[PDB]
Amino acid sequence: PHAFKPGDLVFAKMKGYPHWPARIDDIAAVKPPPNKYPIFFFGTHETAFLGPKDLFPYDKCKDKYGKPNKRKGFNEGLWEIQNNPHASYS
Amino acid sequence: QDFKT
């Protein structure tokens, strides 16, 4: 396995939220601190900076975290990561 | 960028 690179699909964990469908974004923009990545969250289309310890590869982990939730924006995010993970959501 | 709180 290799380091995360822009375009990689993941589940991303933030304090007080379930593991969320997301992608490593291109920094093309506020630049992350050392060894953290810019993360675009599907569904809510928000951004944050997370280190690998909160980043879970999509296809390994989707059986675990890819099940629908009742949380606002989550199911929308499953749709996005499954149907057009590399589109512009701007 | 719309930063998540």
Author numbering:
A (entry chain A): 2 to 29, 32 to 93
B (entry chain T): 76 to 80
Give the text the authors published on this PDB structure:
The PWWP domain comprises 100–130 amine acids and is often present in chromatin-associated proteins. Our structures revealed that the overall fold of the PWWP domain consists of three motifs: a canonical β-barrel core, an insertion motif between the second and third β-strands and a C-terminal α-helix bundle. The canonical β-barrel core harbors an aromatic cage constructed by three aromatic residues, which is a signature feature of the Tudor domain “Royal family”. Taken together, similar to other members in the ‘Royal family’, PWWP domain also exhibits methyllysine histone binding ability.
